[PDB]
């Protein structure tokens, strides 16, 4: 029978996304509340009581929220990553979370190719700069994105060296240390673990050569700040560009003319992506409820 | 044999390629006088007086200079344009003009993709933006430049389309109103001429698909500024991005959110792309001075 699915977007999807998620609702006989631009806690708690399913983006989902919704059953990232859920809550609580693999990939991936092009020619500002054709690119981290910014630097004419802890590739290195000795620049694509948080440092950073360049599309949790300011200190050349601009107030205090960072993330903010992202997600609610579907499951509990 | 050589560079050359221009012709046994960051007329009038070689990047080089210049015998434009050369009055006084073709080509091709996904993407700024991948991108001139452009946008994913007035390619229009009626991106790569002065005015860009953007890496005045502000205020839709900043100051005033230009034409501010041409210029100088070799002059006079 008919679902409550509640869309939690403290940053909205573009209105023809929200339209496109609304109609495969709606027909597959659910109600759909949206809570958008909300500026309390108290807002999505009091929203997700009576909820069925949910649609998240990078909102914070944790335990009060996972607990308020007594009677979800699904939660579906449109997007990517899930470092903003509490899985384990979710594992107690028996409910579904699932992401939609891929479905961001090119407004991210397009975004970190215009990053490494800014970062490379003085943010477009006066002065000289450098050319990314011919010059050796390491991917960091190696799924939908990474595979869609190595054929646009291949286009460009990057070389191109590849490092992933868990899958297989063409021209990869066996240590992520490899990575950032062998590469001039360095594109971030590592999702947020426990065991990448923290991971970008000071002893990995100083591996680099001269003139040097860091983009993150990521995570901002996967630098260590303090080790990356060090790094920056000592090495001038250095440069760090980012979509998910950093806690610490130092980078954009002391390091102008080598640092950028975009207000939000705005990798997935796009027409395209925002359509695919939140479509697959809408699909993927109602498979489930239809067909008790779970393809794409990210988590795992028993009963 | 020996002959002394100026450089005239109000925006210098990188400093290696500096090196490189004086290992070349000093090797030669030729004398090279550098001009650099000069601010008055009569600075280059006075030095211009016993050179018998000139290299010159975007400098204007008018009657009053050339004149002045009594015993030069040549000019090479480091570099791909020569419209700041009054080529007449060095067709009056003999002078061979060259430029060094293709030299410059990745610096302007890299700067042109990231100024695309810079203007498809609000400037780095909050909001919704767009992806260049399945879009259709119009090259308008196809040389050197445009070939690299278009080898970037494919691996992008854009459709390309091409409008050139004198070769012959694949998926070219015939006429540049075909251009502009189904290409979504027009990047532009005409050199200023009598033909091409102000002829991207209202008339073509009102053609434009919903959503277009110009993004400009050519010269100023191939825009009829008049007509691009007009149609600007009428479709709020279109973007216009450039390396070569408009004269009028409308632009900046109204347009902010889907206007951008840099503060100087930094297309060719890399240090690869300085080695390149200034190095090819010596080269040439050299070659003229040694052989005779007149390749690459664009000029045609008698006697």
């Given at each position: 029978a008919s679902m409550k699915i509640v869309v939690i977007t403290e940053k909205p999807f573009a209105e023809n996304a929200v339209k496109g998620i609304r109609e495969i609702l709606e027909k597959a006989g659910h109600?759909?509340?949206?809570?958008?631009?909300?500026?309390?806690?108290?807002?999505?708690?009091?929203?997700?009581?009576?909820?069925?399913?949910?649609?998240?983006?990078s909102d914070k989902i944790d335990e009060e929220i996972i607990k308020a919704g007594e009677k979800v059953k699904i939660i579906v990232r449109a997007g990517a990553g899930y470092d903003n859920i509490d899985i384990e809550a979710c594992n107690q609580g028996k409910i579904v979370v699932m992401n939609t693999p891929g479905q961001n990939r090119n407004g991210v991936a397009e975004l970190c190719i215009g990053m490494m092009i800014f970062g490379f020619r003085k943010?477009?500002?006066?002065?000289?700069?450098?050319?990314?054709?011919?010059?050796?690119?390491?991917?960091?981290?190696?799924?939908?994105?990474?595979?869609?910014?190595?054929?646009?630097?291949?286009?460009?004419?990057?070389?191109?060296?590849?490092?992933?802890?868990?899958?297989?590739?063409?021209?990869?290195?066996?240590?992520?240390?490899?990575?950032?000795?062998?590469?001039?620049?360095?594109?971030?694509?590592?999702?947020?673990?426990?065991?990448?948080?923290?991971?970008?440092?000071?002893?990995?950073?100083?591996?680099?050569?001269?003139?040097?360049?860091?983009?993150?599309?990521?995570?901002k949790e996967i630098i260590d700040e303090e080790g990356l300011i060090r790094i920056m200190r000592e090495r001038e050349?250095?440069?760090?560009?980012?979509?998910?601009?950093?806690?610490?107030?130092?980078?954009?205090?002391?390091?102008?003319?080598?640092?950028?960072?975009?207000?939000?993330?705005?990798?997935?903010?796009?027409?395209?992506?925002?359509?695919?992202?939140?479509?697959?997600?809408?699909?993927?609610?109602?498979?489930?409820?239809?067909?008790?579907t779970v393809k794409f499951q990210v988590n795992k509990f028993l009963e």
């Open positions: 109600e759909v509340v949206m809570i958008e631009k909300y500026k309390k806690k108290e807002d999505v708690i009091e929203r997700i009581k009576d909820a069925d399913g949910v649609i998240v983006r943010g477009f500002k006066e002065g000289k700069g450098r050319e990314l054709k011919d010059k050796t690119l390491g991917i960091c981290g190696c799924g939908y994105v990474g595979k869609r910014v190595k054929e646009i630097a291949e286009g460009i004419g990057m070389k191109i060296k590849v490092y992933d802890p868990f899958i297989t590739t063409e021209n990869q290195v066996k240590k992520i240390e490899e990575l950032f000795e062998e590469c001039q620049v360095i594109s971030l694509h590592l999702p947020l673990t426990k065991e990448t948080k923290g991971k970008i440092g000071y002893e990995l950073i100083k591996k680099l050569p001269y003139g040097g360049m860091i983009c993150n599309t990521a995570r050349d250095l440069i760090y560009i980012t979509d998910v601009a950093p806690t610490s107030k130092v980078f954009n205090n002391e390091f102008k003319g080598r640092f950028f960072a975009t207000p939000i993330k705005i990798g997935a903010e796009t027409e395209e992506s925002n359509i695919n992202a939140g479509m697959a997600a809408a699909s993927q609610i109602c498979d489930f409820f239809t067909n008790g």
